[PDB]
Amino acid sequence: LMVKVLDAVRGSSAINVAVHVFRLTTEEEFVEGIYKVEIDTKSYWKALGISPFHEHAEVVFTANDSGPRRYTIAALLSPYSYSTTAVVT
Template sequence: MMAAAESGPLTTHVLNTGDGVPASRLALSLHRLDSQLKIWSLLSVGTTDEDGRCSGLVGGEALSPGMYRLRFETGPYWESRGQTSFYPYVEVVFTISDPQQSFHLPLLMSRFSYSTYRGS
């Protein structure tokens, strides 16, 4: 599954705060929790662009109320820069109650820390 090229209702922006640059070419994936089976289903995969952004992870029709997980492959990103990291990946779990809204989920990261928030 590939992410759509156009912008969608869920976007992300990854910043390498340790080096003060966008985290370009960082792989990520979006998953949705099946509330009955309690298993995660892969919805899409993507890679950040040169500005550290990834839009179009999912089309509006694919979003429904529920729990989602955005997984950032931080270990391979740091390895590609010749560095090690304490976190091999970062998973951010969040709930969507109104799929008509737009959701922006930035990740600010260094090799030894990360933070995230719901942006606009």
């Protein structure tokens, strides 16, 4: 088997290429993400131990997400060539 990914590219090219070849909670022999970004990810109640709230319990669950937040991202995971990039606010 031969992998002919990219050859003979002459001029003014912006290219993003990725190649990989392979031939309670348990995971084996895996890959999640080669190029991975994440912004403001939240997980709250997952994978609690064996027998949670074993005997005679009560809780109050409150979570507040109120706030002024500003994400200013330009050219994220994206290559350029002969360009003009700006953020003017």
